[PDB]
C-alpha cells in the first residue's frame with residue numbers, strides 16, 4: 001500500500017477510557033491496569049470492556065495510522081461512530097457503528113456480523129489502519145509483512161463522524177498485559 005502519506009497523529013481521549021486503563025503522558029500508549037485507576041465515572045466511558053477512543057474526529061478525506069500490538073494475546077482495533085453505545089454489553093459490528101478487526105484465542109477475525117475469519121501467515125506486530133471517508137472504505141495492513149492487506153470493509157455506511165477505536169483486551173491469562181502503542185510517523 002502507498003497510504004503512508006495520509007498519516008495522521010492520533011492521541012487517546014482519557015475521558016472515553018474504561019476506568020481500569022492507564023494512558024501514557026503523551027496520550028500515545030494504553031494498557032490494562034490491575035485495578036480501577038481512581039477516575040470519576042462519566043457517560044463517555046466504556047464500562048464493560050477495556051476500550052478507549054482517539055481524540056480526533058473524521059468526517060471527510062483519507063486518514064492513516066499505525067498501532068503496535070507486540071506480544072499481546074487479545075485486542076480489537078479500527079474506527080467507530082462518535083455515537084456508539086458506551087454502557088453495557090454489545091457486539092462489534094457495522095450495524096452497531098464499528099469497523100474493526102481483532103486477535104482472540106490465536107485467531108484473527110474481522111468484526112462483521114457474523115465475524116469473518118482472517119488469513120494472516122505472519123502474525124503482525126504493527127497494524128496499519130486506512131480510512132477513506134468519501135469512498136466508504138476501512139482497510140487494515142500487516143506492517144510486519146511488507147504492508148500486506150489483512151481486510152477491507154467496503155460500502156461502509158459511517159452515518160456520523162468517526163473516531164479511532166482501541167481495545168487492549170482483558171488480562172485473565174496474565175499473558176496480555178502489554179500496551180497498545182501509536183507508532184510514530
Ligand SMILES: CN1CCCc2ccc(S(N)(=O)=O)cc21
Nearest residue numbers: 076090091092093102103104115
Ligand atoms: C471483539 N471480540 C474480541 C474477541 C472475541 C470476540 C467474540 C465475539 C465478538 S462479537 N461478534 O460477538 O462482537 C467479538 C469479539
Ligand SMILES: CN1CCCc2ccc(S(N)(=O)=O)cc21
Nearest residue numbers: 049050074075076090167169170
Ligand atoms: C467486545 N467483546 C464482546 C464480547 C466478546 C468479547 C471478547 C473479548 C473481548 S476483549 N478484546 O476486550 O478481550 C471483547 C469482546
